[PDB]
Design a protein that fits this description.
The structure is a homodimer. Chain A folds into two domains: 247 residues, Green fluorescent protein (Green Fluorescent Protein, Beta Barrel); 142 residues, Orthogonal Bundle (Recoverin, domain 1), CATH 1.10.238.10. Helices cover 29% and strands 31% of the residues of chain A. In chain A, the strands form three sheets. In chain A, strands 1-2-3-9-10-11-6-7-8-5-4 form an eleven-stranded mixed β-barrel. In chain A, strands 12-13 form a two-stranded antiparallel sheet. The longest helix of chain A has 19 residues. The radius of gyration of chain A is 24 Å and the shape is globular. The structure holds calcium ion (CA) (8 copies). One calcium ion binds next to strand 12 of chain B. The site of one calcium ion has 7 residues of chain A, from strand 13. Chains A, B: Belongs to the GFP family.
Chain lengths: 389, 389
């Protein structure tokens, strides 16, 4: 009962804490500057416990004179994965990010982002008088809100933690859903680009002030940055390097490929028509209303289609092991078209061809080879589970 | 690479399976019958693997002559927990359910469901000529979409598994959010009630046909049912009893109490005004726009307020142990108002009184007693974690 009073109070306090933490980037029009503002907080994990908050204040303004889109209030939701290159000796950061715009119910610059776009990033920094430089390269694919970059400190040892520079180191690569296209400032300013300025306040420590020019140089999207950091504590979490660094990337890549089977027109979203096409190809013929009911359950932004992050969340929504086992039993039954307990090379071929894969008979045979443990030329349920687990 | 082809194909097949399974109750108007229809599938777990599907077809029609509400298409989402009474020797089922209506963007009978309502359930059944009876009693609170019932087989051993009778054994207790009040058929038909008829098809087995009268008898909501089952297999999953039976209920009760601290007017939903009130009481003063941003992140139905199931999902959204540990560190800091590392009886009192609890100084002291391991009269961080973990 005293225990119950503590728990109930504890839960209420913890609820406020969960409601209170949003790391989303909140964007508003700044009509006087013909651009936008944003504000957001980043929570950096401290090694062996604690969070280091970083309060961001952002403004963006067009470089060029052409008209730009000024948005209604909305936000960007980002998921970042930081990693290392095992064959890299230089101080470095490998980065994978997916960003999508949301927060709103229901340009010529956008044509520049229909496919994969090469990116170069250059940063010249000075933190408490420690000068440093970073260069990065990779690619953006705004269809999926996706960025893939590697960064190198070109001046030796980076004097601050890599995660503190992530937000500084191309919001033009955000995926803005179809109903929000008129609110995408960042692409509207292209190719001439925009200036992005921030102040980033590290609580109980110093701050960064940043100015960047984001624009096309040829077919490359370039982010050239100046950063000045002042007032940092020599044994704070930043100059003292006390911050933590970091689905796998392999896993996400598999899910993207799987997503691509549904997203027939490659626009980064699955429609009821696309889902129906795939289901019909495997012999199931739900009605339009049934297909919408299915999409609705996983359609977190309520725009009526499934984007890749929503697909990801569905496929990452962890299950009871016993549900996981039954889902694999069900998938086996889909592959085993005649129900005899064995997936044949003909059956495998049929499922892959219908989902939209193109494979030779020889490639289908190699798939059976990897799975076929007892050498009968087919894949039974035990062998299927081993392939899938 | 063959491994990758299997995985990517497997994921696509498993995605269709996840999209395809919806156990939601889909409701449509049946204007010719002055009532509604529904259809849905229930997935019953089979002991040691497999699912037994049960396809439901439902119609409801008013008993009385008064006008009723006929809805636009929507659905009910339910979460059920089945349990046993340790001091019960009779064949029985204890049941806890939360049901909420959804699927739509943005009556006098409803007045009968503003508080807790007693429920009686009576079922007379015949499955493959095995006659049986069930009686149940409990309470519904439609404010939270909540049902709490205990059922007893009054004829001895139940000849079918309890989980197969759940849907048969009061959708008037569903929580219809404010924007959907005009689509709540079930309460609109009260007090005179409605007739609910189903056929339930157990795949590869027999079926139940059911007819029920749901109505008020005095202040009690009564569900009186006739069930006939035919064509069941003697060693199928139903007559062979091969189905599985079953947050804890304690846990959910704690979360409800915590929810109640926010839901000041007891209407079962937390508004920005309510959340602001609680946050202000603990010293934080977010703006209306900030409070809406907070609610939006957890507001799965997009109606702008947090209902109890949404609160539950937020508080059940499992975390990395290290995030869990930091959330407890943060909660400690909230209780420790002067930051000295110790929660005093005065500080505890202040937090509870401000959240809206009413406690005597003696009750606050007993809380400190349970937590205070080293007898200094206050609660340090180590003691707090033990109380909270
Ligand atoms: Ca598409
Ligand atoms: Ca969507
Ligand atoms: Ca076969
Ligand atoms: Ca084999
Ligand atoms: Ca309320
Ligand atoms: Ca809501
Ligand atoms: Ca204190
Ligand atoms: Ca103590």
């Amino acid at each position: 009962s005293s225990r119950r009073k503590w728990n109930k109070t504890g839960h209420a306090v913890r609820a406020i804490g969960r409601l209170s933490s949003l790391e989303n980037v909140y964007i508003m029009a700044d009509k006087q500057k013909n651009g936008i503002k944003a504000n957001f907080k980043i929570r950096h994990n401290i090694e062996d416990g604690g969070v280091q908050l970083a309060y961001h204040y952002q403004q963006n303004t067009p470089i060029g004179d052409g008209p730009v889109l000024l948005p209604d209030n909305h936000y960007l939701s980002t998921q970042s994965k930081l990693s290392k290159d095992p064959n890299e000796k230089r101080d470095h950061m490998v980065l994978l990010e997916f960003v999508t715009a949301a927060g709103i119910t229901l340009s010529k610059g956008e044509e520049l982002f229909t496919g994969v776009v090469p990116i170069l990033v250059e940063l010249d920094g000075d933190v408490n008088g420690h000068k440093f430089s970073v260069s990065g390269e990779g690619e953006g694919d705004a269809t999926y809100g996706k960025l893939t970059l590697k960064f190198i400190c070109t001046t030796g040892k980076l004097p601050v933690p890599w995660p503190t520079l992530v937000t500084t180191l191309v919001q033009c690569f955000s995926r803005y859903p179809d109903h929000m296209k008129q609110h995408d400032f960042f692409k509207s300013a292209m190719p001439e680009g925009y200036i992005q300025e921030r102040t980033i306040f590290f609580k109980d420590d110093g701050n960064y002030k940043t100015r960047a020019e984001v624009k096309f140089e040829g077919d490359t999207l370039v982010n050239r940055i100046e950063l000045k950091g002042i007032d940092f504590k020599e044994d704070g979490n930043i100059l003292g390097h006390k911050l933590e660094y970091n689905l796998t990337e392999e896993q996400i890549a598999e899910f993207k490929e799987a997503f691509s089977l549904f997203d027939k027109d490659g626009d980064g979203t699955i429609t009821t028509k696309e889902l129906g096409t795939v289901m019909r190809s495997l012999g199931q013929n739900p009605t339009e209303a049934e297909l919408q009911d299915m999409i609705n359950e996983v359609d977190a932004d309520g725009n009526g289609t499934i984007d890749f992050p929503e697909f990801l969340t569905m496929m990452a929504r962890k299950m009871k092991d016993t549900d996981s086992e039954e889902e694999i039993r069900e998938a086996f039954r889909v592959f085993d078209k005649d129900g005899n307990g064995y997936i044949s090379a003909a059956e495998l071929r049929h499922v892959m061809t219908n989902l939209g894969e193109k494979l030779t008979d020889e490639e289908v045979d190699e798939m059976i080879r990897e799975a076929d443990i007892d050498g009968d030329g087919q894949v039974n349920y035990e062998e299927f589970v081993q392939m899938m687990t």
